[PDB]
Design a protein around this ligand. Sequence first.
Ligand code: BCL
Ligand code: BCL
Ligand code: BCL
Ligand code: BCL
Ligand code: BCL
Ligand code: BCL
Ligand code: BCL
Ligand code: BCL
Ligand code: BCL
Ligand SMILES: COC(C)(C)C\C=C/C(C)=C/C=C/C(C)=C/C=C/C(C)=C/C=C/C=C(C)/C=C/C=C(C)/C=C/C=C(C)/C=C/CC(C)(C)OC
Lengths: 42, 42, 42, 42, 42, 42, 42, 42, 42, 42, 42, 42, 42, 42, 43, 43, 43, 43, 43, 43, 43, 43, 43, 43, 43, 43, 43, 43
Amino acid sequence: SMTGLTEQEAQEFHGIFVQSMTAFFGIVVIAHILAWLWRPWL
Amino acid sequence: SMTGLTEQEAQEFHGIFVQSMTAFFGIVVIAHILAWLWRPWL
Amino acid sequence: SMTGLTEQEAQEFHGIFVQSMTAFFGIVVIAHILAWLWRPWL
Amino acid sequence: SMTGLTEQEAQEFHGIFVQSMTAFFGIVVIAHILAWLWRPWL
Amino acid sequence: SMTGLTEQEAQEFHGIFVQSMTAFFGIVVIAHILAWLWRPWL
Amino acid sequence: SMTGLTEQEAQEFHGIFVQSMTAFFGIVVIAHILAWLWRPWL
Amino acid sequence: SMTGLTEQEAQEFHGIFVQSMTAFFGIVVIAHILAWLWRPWL
Amino acid sequence: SMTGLTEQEAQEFHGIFVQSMTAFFGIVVIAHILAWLWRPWL
Amino acid sequence: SMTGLTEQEAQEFHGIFVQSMTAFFGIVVIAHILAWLWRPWL
Amino acid sequence: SMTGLTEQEAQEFHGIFVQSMTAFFGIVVIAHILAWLWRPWL
Amino acid sequence: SMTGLTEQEAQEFHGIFVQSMTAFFGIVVIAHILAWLWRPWL
Amino acid sequence: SMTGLTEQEAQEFHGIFVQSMTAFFGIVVIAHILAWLWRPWL
Amino acid sequence: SMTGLTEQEAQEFHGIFVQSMTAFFGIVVIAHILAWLWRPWL
Amino acid sequence: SMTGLTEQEAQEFHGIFVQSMTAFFGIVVIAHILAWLWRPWL
Amino acid sequence: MHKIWQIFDPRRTLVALFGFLFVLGLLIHFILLSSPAFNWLSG
Amino acid sequence: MHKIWQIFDPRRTLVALFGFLFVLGLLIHFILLSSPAFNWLSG
Amino acid sequence: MHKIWQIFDPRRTLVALFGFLFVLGLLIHFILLSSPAFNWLSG
Amino acid sequence: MHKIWQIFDPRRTLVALFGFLFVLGLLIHFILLSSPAFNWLSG
Amino acid sequence: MHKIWQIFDPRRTLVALFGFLFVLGLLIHFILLSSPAFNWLSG
Amino acid sequence: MHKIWQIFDPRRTLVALFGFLFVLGLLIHFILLSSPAFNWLSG
Amino acid sequence: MHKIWQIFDPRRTLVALFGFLFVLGLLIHFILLSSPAFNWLSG
Amino acid sequence: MHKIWQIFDPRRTLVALFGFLFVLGLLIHFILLSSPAFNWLSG
Amino acid sequence: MHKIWQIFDPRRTLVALFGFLFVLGLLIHFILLSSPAFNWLSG
Amino acid sequence: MHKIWQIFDPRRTLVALFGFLFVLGLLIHFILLSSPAFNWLSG
Amino acid sequence: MHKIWQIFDPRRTLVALFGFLFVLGLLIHFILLSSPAFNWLSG
Amino acid sequence: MHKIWQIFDPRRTLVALFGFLFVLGLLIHFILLSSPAFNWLSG
Amino acid sequence: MHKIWQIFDPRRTLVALFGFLFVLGLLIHFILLSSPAFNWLSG
Amino acid sequence: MHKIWQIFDPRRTLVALFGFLFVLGLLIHFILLSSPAFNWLSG
Ligand code: BCL
Ligand code: BCL
Ligand code: BCL
Ligand code: BCL
Ligand code: BCL
Ligand code: BCL
Ligand code: BCL
Ligand code: BCL
Ligand code: BCL
Ligand SMILES: COC(C)(C)C\C=C/C(C)=C/C=C/C(C)=C/C=C/C(C)=C/C=C/C=C(C)/C=C/C=C(C)/C=C/C=C(C)/C=C/CC(C)(C)OC
């Protein structure tokens, strides 16, 4: 609409983006659980 | 009117913008409640 | 007259501007009443 | 004369300018009276 | 003669300029009398 | 799609990229195991 | 001769320049007499 | 594909690059063995 | 000869220049005599 | 291939380059032997 | 020859230059005699 | 070949260059022998 | 040859240059003799 | 060869250059003999 | 009073106003933090 | 006196006036904060 | 209120808003780290 | 004396005059604040 | 929500996101190193 | 003596003269403030 | 997941990745040298 | 001796001369202020 | 794996590699000189 | 010896000479002021 | 191995090589001068 | 020996020579002023 | 070996060579002046 | 040996030679002034 991507190219990029972000957040959550097990900060 | 969007593209962007802002503010409110239960500042 | 807005577009912008500024000032007044209840400065 | 405004556009702007400046000066005078009742400086 | 103004525009500007400068100087004189009654410096 | 590579050139680069990154991560993991046997940090 | 003024415009300017400078010097002389009566420096 | 080299010029460059890098790494390994016999750091 | 002035314009400027410089030097001499009567420096 | 030299010019430059580098390295080796007999560093 | 002056314009400038420089040097010599009478430095 | 000199101009320059460098090195060697008889550094 | 002066303009400049340099060096020599009679430095 | 001088303009310059450099070196040698007679540094 | 929007651009004015208001809020909050009597983050 | 608007641009004059007034208010408030007798944020 | 998107560019606004919100979060977290009463990384 | 307005521009002159007058007032007020005998904000 | 990719470039956004995430991770790791209670490299 | 106005621009000369006179007055007033015997704002 | 190479240049990405990895390795090695408990070159 | 005006511009010679004379007067007055024996503003 | 030479220029890559290797060797040699235990030029 | 004016511009030679002479006189007067034995403004 | 001369220029390469070799020799000689055990000019 | 003036520009040579001679005289006079044994302005 | 002159400009090589040789001689002479054991101008 | 003047320009070479010789003489004289044993201006 403004960059050049159609709604099918945007839905193709959005799905992979959400999957990658979810994997990143899962790794982050596991790391933070390990950190809390190591040294709780609250 | 000034940037190029019509009333339908501006109402479509406004709805998603308001939903995202509401989700952001809800997460912020939960975080601030947790912070107050952690360390009240007033 | 000087920027490009007609009188109807300026009256349309002025109403929304005044409503937004009034909401902002109401929130500001509530916050300042709360601050006076917390720590009066005069 | 030199900017582009006629005597009617300049008189239209001058009236609103003087009204706004008078309102500003009235608010300023009230604030200064309040400040004098708070802490006189002379 | 040099900047573009005629003798009627220069006399029209000169009268208003002199009136404004006289008002400014009168306000200044009143302020300086008040200052002298507040704290003489000589 | 955006740079110029087709999906066959992107799948050819992706395979070699993933193999190289996997080899790099395996060397990194071996080095980190050796470092842990040398000086554990947790 | 060098700037553009004729000798009638230069003599028109010179008379006003001399009158203004003489008034300035008279005010300066009065101020310096007042200063000497206030605090002589020699 | 991207810089201009063909597969035969790249395979010709890759072989010499790998041979030179292997010789460099062998010299580095001998130097590091000599350093360990001189002053072990672990 | 080099700037554009003729010998009559240069002699007209030279006379006024010499008169002005002589007046300046006379004022300077009077001031220096007054300074010597005030505080001799040699 | 990339600069402009043919292989006959590159081979004939390579021989002189290698001879000069070998002479340089031999002089360096003699100097380093002399330095070791003067002050061993290991 | 190199700047634009002829031999008659150069001789005209040279005579006045030498006269002015001689007057300057005479004033300098008188000043230096007065200075030596005031405070000899050798 | 690369700068513009032929094989005879380069050979002509090389002979004089080598002779000059040999003279420079002979002077350097004599100076260094003198310096060693003055203050040996090894 | 390189600047533009002929052999007659270069010989005419050279004679005056040498005369001026000789006069300068004679004045310098007299000054240095006077300085040695004032304060010898060797 | 590179600048523009022929073999005759370079031999004419070389002779004068060598004569001037020889005179400079002779003056330098006399000065250094005088300096050694004044304060030997070795 | 609406005629100001025919003199002042509705958007450059609005962006400048929002920026100045944000900077003003930052400044006032930083001033109250520098004052010990009104610093709410100590205690 | 209205003819000043045929000499001075209504918008650039007005923007400059608003900016100078804001800077003047900031300056006066800061000066009163730097004066112990008129600092209202101490105590 | 949606008409603001006909005045403000949806993407440049979003970029500026996200940048200012990130800088604001960084600033608030750094201010709370500089306050001993609210530093959670000490202890 | 009005002919000065045929030499000097009514607007640039006037802007410069207002600017120098404002800077002069600021300077005089700041000088009196730097003088203990005439500082009105102490006490 | 995918329509953000019609407003924001998939690559410039993605490069900026990766760079900001890397700088944020560096900042958080450095802040935890500056805190003695959470420095894992001392001991 | 009026011929100077055919050599010197009546306006640039006049602006320069006014500026130099103002700076000279400021300098003289500042020199007297720096001299304790002639400082009128002390006491 | 390979489609990222249709969004990102295999060579500028790869050069940037190698440079960031090298700088990261240098930084981590320097940080372990600044920590006495993990400095391997002392002793 | 008048021929100097055929060599030097009556206006730039004159402006430069006035400027150098003013700077010279300022310098001489400042030097006499820096000398206690000739400072007339002390006492 | 050879196809990297169709993405990366053999010469600029090679110059960059040689420069980085030289700077890395200088850095490692300077780090070992700064460490008393591994300085070989002392004693 | 007059031929120097065919090599050297009279106006630039006069300007440079006058400037150098003025700077030389200033330098000599300043050096004597820095000389206690030859300072005429002390006493 | 000679093919490197079809990738690298015999002259720029050679100039760079000579420059880096000279700077390396300077560096090594300065380092040995900064080491008291290997300074040959002390004594 | 005169042929040097077919090689050197007389005016640029003369200007450079005069400037270097003036700077040399200044340097020598300043060096002798900095030497107490040859300072003629002390005493 | 003469063919280096077909690669290296006979004149920028001799100029650079002469300049580097002069700088090297200056460096070596200055290093011996900074070494007390080899300073020939002390004593 | 004269062929150097077909390679080296006489004027630029000669100017550079004279400048370097002058700077070298200045440097050598300044070094002897910095050495107490060879300073001829003390005593
Ligand atoms: C403080 C006590 C703990 C510790 C607990 C924490 C906690 C808790 C977390 C980390 C996280 C990380 N820690 Mg830590 N960490 C410690 C000490 C270390 C030290 C060290 C020298 O000791 C190192 C170098 C690391 C390194 C890391 C990284 C693996 C990771 C941050 C990467 C990032 O910013 O991606 C962000 C940048 C990107 C570009 C990500 C993009 C992702 C996309 C989908 C993939 C594209 C490739 C991309 C270019 C790189 C991806 C890298 C991976 C996502 C890691 N930690 C110690 C001992 N650390 C975090 C993590 O797990 O994140 C994954 C995390 O939650
Ligand atoms: C001070 C005591 C508390 C604490 C209480 C507070 C409180 C109270 C709050 C936070 C908030 C945040 N805290 Mg904190 N926080 C603490 C310590 C930490 C530490 C740490 C190293 O210990 C980390 C790294 C964080 C990190 C964060 C982020 C998760 C979040 C701010 C994100 C932001 O600025 O979005 C702003 C920028 C954007 C671009 C948001 C845009 C949103 C849109 C809809 C989504 C688009 C994606 C966008 C690019 C990124 C979205 C990120 C998420 C919204 C978080 N906190 C401790 C222990 N913190 C706040 C929060 O919850 O925000 C959500 C919040 O209210
Ligand atoms: C000092 C004792 C009090 C306190 C009392 C005060 C008082 C009193 C006030 C605030 C106000 C604010 N305080 Mg506070 N505040 C405290 C501590 C904090 C801390 C903290 C880390 O503890 C935070 C981050 C804040 C944050 C804030 C903001 C919510 C708000 C200023 C926003 C602004 O400048 O908009 C200005 C910029 C704009 C662009 C506004 C534009 C409005 C339009 C209509 C909406 C468009 C969206 C726009 C882009 C963003 C709108 C934001 C909201 C209007 C807030 N306060 C404490 C504990 N604070 C003020 C407020 O309520 O303002 C609403 C206010 O009156
Ligand atoms: C020192 C002891 C006194 C004091 C005695 C003095 C004396 C004495 C005088 C002032 C004057 C002023 N004082 Mg005070 N003043 C004090 C402390 C203050 C403090 C403070 C925080 O305490 C404030 C903010 C002021 C502010 C002022 C201004 C109202 C005024 C200078 C305005 C100016 O420069 O216009 C100059 C710039 C212009 C552009 C003016 C142009 C005029 C034209 C005709 C109108 C066009 C509008 C123009 C843009 C703005 C007009 C402003 C008004 C003319 C003021 N005073 C105290 C307590 N002050 C002076 C004054 O009254 O001036 C009118 C004055 O004579
Ligand atoms: C702290 C206690 C340990 C130690 C434990 C750690 C741990 C744990 C690790 C290292 C890692 C490394 N250490 Mg260490 N390390 C120590 C001391 C040293 C010293 C030294 C002066 O003593 C040096 C020279 C090194 C050097 C190294 C490198 C070999 C490597 C980081 C390379 C890199 O960043 O690639 C990143 C940049 C790239 C461009 C990689 C790209 C990879 C692709 C596939 C190949 C292309 C070629 C590319 C240009 C270069 C490849 C290099 C290799 C992958 C190494 N270590 C000590 C004694 N070190 C890490 C490693 O093994 O990495 C492989 C690692 O995990
Ligand atoms: C040191 C002890 C004495 C003192 C003794 C000296 C002596 C002795 C002399 C001065 C001179 C001057 N002194 Mg004093 N002076 C003292 C203290 C002061 C103080 C002060 C704050 O107390 C000031 C304001 C001055 C100011 C002045 C000026 C009136 C004058 C330098 C003007 C100039 O440089 O023109 C130079 C620049 C020009 C442009 C002149 C050009 C002339 C042409 C023909 C006219 C064109 C108009 C031109 C633009 C301005 C003309 C100004 C007048 C010529 C003065 N004196 C004290 C108390 N002073 C000198 C003087 O009288 O000069 C006339 C002078 O000889
Ligand atoms: C530290 C204790 C020792 C000492 C032992 C070491 C050791 C060990 C070595 C040197 C080496 C050198 N030492 Mg040492 N050295 C000492 C003190 C000195 C002092 C001094 C004033 O005290 C001087 C000036 C030198 C100078 C030198 C150079 C002769 C040489 C490095 C030149 C170079 O970098 O070429 C590199 C740059 C080039 C451009 C070379 C290019 C070669 C090509 C084929 C020829 C083209 C001409 C080229 C432009 C210049 C050639 C120069 C020669 C090859 C030297 N040494 C002392 C007393 N030194 C090294 C050497 O012998 O190198 C040959 C060496 O191995
Ligand atoms: C150190 C103890 C002595 C002393 C002994 C020395 C000795 C010894 C010498 C000087 C020389 C000079 N000294 Mg001394 N000198 C002393 C103190 C001073 C003081 C002072 C404030 O006390 C002054 C200002 C001077 C000034 C001078 C100059 C007259 C002259 C250097 C001019 C020059 O550099 O021309 C160089 C620049 C030029 C451009 C010259 C060009 C010549 C051509 C032919 C003429 C063209 C005109 C040209 C533009 C200017 C000519 C100026 C004259 C040649 C002087 N001396 C004391 C008391 N001085 C030297 C001299 O006599 O030079 C002539 C000299 O030999
Ligand atoms: C240290 C104890 C001695 C001393 C012993 C040394 C020794 C030893 C020497 C000098 C030399 C010089 N000394 Mg000494 N010198 C002393 C103190 C001084 C003092 C001082 C303030 O006391 C000064 C002004 C000088 C000045 C000089 C110069 C005359 C000369 C360096 C000129 C030069 O660099 O040309 C180089 C630059 C050029 C451009 C030369 C070019 C030559 C061509 C052929 C001519 C063209 C004209 C050219 C532009 C200028 C020629 C100048 C003359 C050649 C001098 N000496 C004391 C008291 N001095 C040297 C000398 O005699 O050189 C001739 C020399 O050997
Ligand atoms: C076009 O080609 C034709 C057709 C003409 C054929 C010709 C081909 C030719 C002539 C090819 C020639 C090829 C050559 C000469 C190749 C040479 C290759 C070499 C020497 C490769 C070497 C590689 C070395 C590498 C990649 C080393 C990497 C090291 C790393 C990344 C180290 C990192 C260290 C880190 C980050 C951390 C720790 C270090 C410390 C502790 C210091 O940090 C503080």
